């Protein structure tokens, strides 16, 4: 009396099976769900005009990379791309299927300031979400992503209680709606690196946020077995002149997770934030030298997989082979890092 | 450090002044915000076809009633009506302004089941809400309404914790967004009368829900001075063969409010739910014989103001004068009831 | 199913009747519950040795003051005094009864630091409390007092979430246990004036704390009708060179209460903290010029009633008449202030 | 700003080292902390008079069992026993030390009904706890135990929100106080088997309770690395005519833990409740066939280790050797079960 109705065994099985496929050993996620605007920025850094045609060429360049599925279990898409065709006319989802890569879809509607906070953000998107999920499933998506953002600012008391409460509520609602529609939800509570705080401050805040997030997931009847977490690694703030060592980042990151995340969750797929391609790989590798772990520790990387690919492509289609080569180099690096085998390229 | 930024004094003053105008002595709200579909039902009960033209005729019939503003402080509109013209071509908002009635706008997007509950409902509508509020203010609205719904079912543990938490969260977010856009939010947590429960059960549940709602309003930095509450009266369930006496309903309703509602809130504008026109008036009157109170106890009635008006109109335009006469009779009854002067027509 | 069992009507009636007697117009509480140690301090300020005999002489001096019950509704006692005799051999409780003053009893066991906080305090005393309440009732007490303490320090994030949560939990448990044993609980969440913060900061913190306290009282099934609140007034911090004006203190204090305290509570009996005898009276008077209010605004004063009495007594028993004269002068001042009739001696 | 002060590294290290020693592979806890009264019952079942002398004989019989430390990592004592001598005059703690068994101490003060609940229980004992912990550490204890109790009753909505909130608060305060005094806290939220509910109902309730408990531990800055959990196994209610199979009990128990318990916790030491000696062993064994796990799954058994020992002793001192033999048989069975090697004697 008063508890959650039981989830459909058939639905739960599909979700858990797909979450484990996504969190497969030696593999991770390619985050290619840059919005129309976010991608304008990238394309600018190489002097390419943000036409549909160019976005389609580039997503094709990414997803038609031969052998990518050896290292990439899933790809997060923007809505445009989920329903797009490559220049050659092949649906993007069909390129993914041919490599055995699972399509995923970004489903949040972005950020809005919480009234009477100092620019702290709510994530919007619950309205119509259930119906969007149904359509996206029919289109071939099997997982979803919703990004929430928090800031650290000791002087301003950020993240405030209202920020944390809102982030947790939105994530939990989103996750339960996804699971009702047969999509594995990636739960992304990103604590931004902005500021001059120490790694120990990041650790404290991450622990408080994740404790709140997982309590809310429980309150909303979210099946952990069919969900994934996409958190920040625990690091110094980005205004620190010294970056924390890989050993330190690995230690505090793993500690923060083991202190808060129940082990029924199958996978933790880190965001890379502002990290270099090489740091993102080495930090993950260092965590998986500390293994074995109670959940898979892996990656969901955008820039950390794409930065060099883009710089090599330059908008020039004859640079397509070289660009896919460097994507593969980074996919391989991060797949090896998942296993603690990348060769380069206790505090309570 | 970590508290709500202070609200603009200029914005707060406008909100508080408008909330007090709405909760004016001897006056209340006419709820005329029936959706396209909800109004189909009413129109059916008198054999009228739900054309735009008929909706416009009827809303015109309501709002052009001469002298209505003696008893009606505000009118909640559906979006269609806010931007509609009367048959004669006069904007609906201009009919309201001529009587000195403040226009209000329904801003929720209706109900959706919470995953893995027994059909318990979340209220949707936060996405785009801030931008809608801006447009609605420019169109002449000065207050808003968002309806959440809860059910009593002892056998099923309803309302569940998740239901109450969701209702409170949605209301608090909605209220803070309204106030950021210069709209007075009406906070409507409606506990449905469905079921066979006693009035004392309704009292317990209402108290728990309102305690949760007002804690969440505080958490979200909602200005009580510039808000209104629209709760159910406390009554027996609708499957009870005996309705509670007016004295009983008045006693438990006032008790539930005084136990939970801080007195900085200017007004409590009751919904009538399924009550007869006469019960709705007599119940309010009985509460205001128990005065004076720490907040204004008044009405926000739809059917309880319109039922006879509609039955008298019948779709026939020559019945327009008679229909407006009975609307006035009910507006007067409820204005007098607000004052505890309607003449008919302690337990811990 | 799952709600609080109903309180005994007979018990509830007694509690509500006694709370209203305590919060009687033109009257307030004399706080004379200084512990053995706290009183050592006072006695030191006039060169008196803290013998039992002297404590008994002084409490006798206080409670045998002729006509004190005109202005004093109740007296909070320390346990020693509840079971003590005057030098002449008359039980202290019998001196109170002769003036029609209701005996009350301090029941907390003092403060202990919350582990891993910066010296933030839990209030101890729940163990054996129910049994102590029974004994104290048999001894003649009809109300109780439990003091919790919070600090403001923006730089340290005080009061922290853990501090507020603990204060609210302890107060709510204590209050429900009192009411189960026929004692009216005085709920005292004291926010200390320590620091250099502005009155607006005190207002914000007081509102957050009281919102949390009253939510917890509701959660624990506390009957507001049979309880009293003893909060700090809202003021500048004690390290401010300029004290806030009486008008300001009255405005923010009343505002903070109306924003958080449900009006079923019969009385708010302010603590005076470090205020002068005259400020404590003038601040209360100023609040009751702003009346009428939804609850009685009155006093529960220790030093603000006793400071001059003590200075006049000096330990010399021939100074007993003069000492009782000045106690009466202050009792009268504060009784008149309760009515907004003491003659001296909107921001959102 | 506003977070927990960091725990002493030296204190944390001791706690984590001792918790891991207690949760050692192939070992578990002997719960011998029966109060004066609880032990009267046991002694009655074999016609022994509850003298101090007999309690001392029996605790001596238990703790002087040769080779017990092969299977027993720790022993929970009642306060009497911690400061007691064996008949031969050897301190009980010295018998434990000789086998390398760590002494632990029960520190709660038992149960009291929460006002206006249907006999739902708060655990008392926080007052003086910090000072008791200091004394107990000096006496040789290195871990503590605090028992909270919850009931399942769907018809009554048990466990109610107030019950769960209280249990979590008391456990978290107790745990943080222990850790401040260098004692490893065993966190025991026992959900009683009373009633006719299914194992799936027990699973739901256990998950809700543990989610609340671990959120509160986080809120109170409890170091999971230096704590232990002592939960009920997940089973049918005791009024069920069919007991769940060992495979079922193992499945739902492990599931409930992996869904709620962060893996930084070193050990889960089950209580046996009303289970037979053999069921308690077989259920644990079945869980550790499902290994390896993210935390040690082991035992903290009273009756399940002592029932036969007592029946064999009978109060007769010549039966002492036989009694210790059967204690050893059960210690061995449960040590082997910890390893998934006892030989007898997915649903979402």
From Swiss-Prot, chains A, B, C, D:
Pathway it works in: Carbohydrate degradation; glycolysis; D-glyceraldehyde 3-phosphate and glycerone phosphate from D-glucose: step 4/4
Residues that, per the record, bind beta-D-fructose 1,6-bisphosphate: 42, 272-274, 300, 303
Tagged with keyword Transmembrane helix: no
Entry annotated with the keyword Cytoplasm: yes
Consequence of changing residue 147 to A: Abolishes enzymatic activity. Reduces ACT1 binding. Reduces MIC2 binding
Keywords: Actin-binding, Cytoplasm, Glycolysis, Lyase, Schiff base
Protein name, UniProt field: Fructose-bisphosphate aldolase 1
Organism expressing this protein natively: Toxoplasma gondii
CDD domains named in the record: FBP_aldolase_I_a (cd00948)
Record NCBIfam families: FrucBisAld_I
Deleted gene: phenotype: Conditional knockdown results in growth defects. Decreased intracellular ATP levels. Decreased number of trails produced during parasite motility. Decreased ability of parasites to attach to and invade host cells.
Entry similarity comment: Belongs to the class I fructose-bisphosphate aldolase family.
GO biological process, one term: glycolytic process
Lineage of the organism: Eukaryota, Sar, Alveolata, Apicomplexa, Conoidasida
Xref: Pfam families: Glycolytic
InterPro entries: Aldolase_I_AS (IPR029768), Aldolase_TIM (IPR013785), FBA_I (IPR000741)
Compartmental location: Cytoplasm
pH effect summary: Optimum pH is 6.0-8.0.
UniProt-annotated binding residues for D-glyceraldehyde 3-phosphate: 35, 38, 106, 188
UniProt GO MF annotations: actin binding; fructose-bisphosphate aldolase activity
Positions bound to dihydroxyacetone phosphate: 33, 145, 230, 272-273, 302-303
């Amino acid at each position: 009396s008063g508890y959650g109705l039981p989830i459909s065994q058939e639905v739960a099985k599909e979700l858990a099976e797909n979450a484990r496929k996504i969190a497969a050993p030696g593999k991770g996620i390619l985050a290619a769900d840059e919005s129309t605007g976010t991608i304008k920025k990238r394309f600018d850094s190489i002097g390419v005009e943000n036409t549909e045609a160019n976005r389609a060429f580039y997503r094709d360049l990414l997803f038609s990379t031969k052998g990518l599925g050896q290292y990439i279990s899933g790809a997060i898409l923007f809505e445009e791309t989920l329903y797009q065709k490559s220049p050659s006319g092949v649906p993007m989802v069909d390129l993914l299927k041919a490599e055995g890569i699972i399509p995923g879809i970004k489903v949040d509607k972005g950020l809005e300031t919480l009234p009477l906070t100092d620019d702290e953000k709510a994530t919007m998107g619950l309205d119509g979400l259930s119906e969007r999920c149904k359509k996206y499933y029919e289109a071939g998506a099997r997982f979803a992503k919703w990004r929430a953002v928090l800031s650290i600012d000791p002087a301003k008391g950020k993240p405030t209680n209202l920020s944390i409460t809102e982030v947790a509520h939105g994530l939990a609602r989103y996750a339960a709606i996804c699971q009702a529609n047969r999509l594995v939800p990636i739960v992304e509570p990103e604590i931004l690196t902005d500021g001059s705080h120490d790694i120990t401050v990041c650790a404290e805040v991450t622990e408080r946020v994740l404790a709140a997030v997982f309590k809310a997931l429980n309150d909303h009847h979210v099946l952990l077995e069919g969900a994934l977490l996409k958190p920040n690694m625990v690091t110094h703030g980005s205004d620190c002149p010294k970056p924390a060592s890989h050993e330190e980042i690995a230690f505090y990151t793993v500690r923060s997770l083991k202190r808060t995340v129940p082990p029924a969750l199958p996978g933790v797929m880190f965001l890379s934030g502002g990290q270099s391609e090489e740091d993102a790989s080495l930090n993950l590798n260092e965590m998986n030298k500390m293994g074995p772990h109670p959940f898979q520790l892996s990656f969901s990387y955008g820039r950390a997989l794409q930065a060099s690919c883009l710089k090599a492509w330059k908008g020039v289609p004859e640079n397509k082979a070289k660009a896919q080569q460097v994507l593969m180099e980074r996919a391989r690096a991060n797949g090896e890092a998942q296993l603690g085998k990348y060769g380069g390229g206790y505090v309570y």
